């Protein structure tokens, strides 16, 4: 023998959707963080008045 082979190889990235399209769902989850609180804001002060 007298054999030394030490080797390397390269990676295959699984198609993780591979587009920005993920953002739109992320935009919906923005808005549900965003547009919800003022309901309570005006709710508690509607209840004050």
């Amino acid at each position: 023998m007298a054999e030394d082979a030490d080797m390397r190889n390269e990676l295959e990235e699984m198609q993780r959707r591979a587009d920005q399209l993920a953002d739109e769902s992320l935009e919906s989850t923005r808005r549900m963080l965003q547009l919800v609180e003022e309901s309570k804001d005006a709710g508690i002060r509607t209840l004050v008045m």
């Binding site: 547009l35 919800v36 509607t46 008045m49």
Partner: protein, 51 residues
């Protein structure tokens, strides 16, 4: 989020519903005790009108 939009829009209804109703109480605000200002200040005289 559309459920949110719907309840938030029914709530920008609601906050304004109770808002717009709210001032009618200020309309009463005169007629609740200035009305009393007529009633008691008058019957203090009706009871003195016999005299």
């Amino acid at each position: 989020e559309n459920s949110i939009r719907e309840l938030h829009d029914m709530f920008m209804d609601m906050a304004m519903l109770v808002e717009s109703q709210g001032e009618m109480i200020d309309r009463i605000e005169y007629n609740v005790e200035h009305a009393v200002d007529y009633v008691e200040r008058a019957v203090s005289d009706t009871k003195k009108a016999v005299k």
